[PDB]
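Please review this one:
***
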Amino acid sequence: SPRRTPQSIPYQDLPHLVNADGQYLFCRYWKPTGTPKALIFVSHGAGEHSGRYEELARMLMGLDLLVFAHDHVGHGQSEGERMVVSDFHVFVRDVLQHVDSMQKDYPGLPVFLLGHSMGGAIAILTAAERPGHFAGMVLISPLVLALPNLSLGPIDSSVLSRNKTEVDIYNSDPLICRAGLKVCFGIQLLNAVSRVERALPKLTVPFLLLQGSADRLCDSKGAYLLMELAKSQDKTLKIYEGAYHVLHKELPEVTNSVFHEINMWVSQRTA
């Protein structure tokens, strides 16, 4: 029988890649009409998927950038047991495989990484594995500071965003895993934090860091440590006072600023 997404859709009727462990990863592309100026990979957070980046990717596409993503293992429309990973590195290995495939088809173009929460940690660890390979890194509230089938317990969805509509969209998306954090996975996310800490003295990639003051998931303290401990010569921090975790899904005031800020930073670093 043909390989299906956890939502019974055959992978042959969809854009995909097969990872080093023989697992199918669902892919997304936002290719412009013109000739692309640069490539940008979108790395999503824990529980979410690439589809949540539609508006942000459609903006970046407008700047003549080729936007590409994939749902991480055990997430969205990709294979694997929900929110489980053999080792946190699997995520980094799969991002590099996708980046290398795209670079082959578009040689000489600069590559950027855009990551949120877990996807932020993945982005950091990707750049550290390949010093001087990426043009820049954009980080929206990254994961930087802190019997196996046991769960931690569902989080209160109101802590995600102050925008009541966006919380409602989140709570009704079937591709979003709203179940609590798995203990096994929790151990992996602590490895990610420990590995991000050890990589900081060698992190040289230019970065833009967007963080909310009232984030109850990724404490702002971590963003201040990241700005201090990273070796990057080109590092910018933007704090959104009173804003929660999902900054690209926050109040219109925060969201429009976020979009413009990513627009200006990426545009300045392209030609």
In short: Residues 245 and 252 are 14 Å apart (CA to CA). The chain has one domain: 1-271. Strands lie at 16-18, 24-30, 38-43, 65-70, 111-116, 136-140, 207-212, 235-240. The first helix runs from residue 54 to 62.
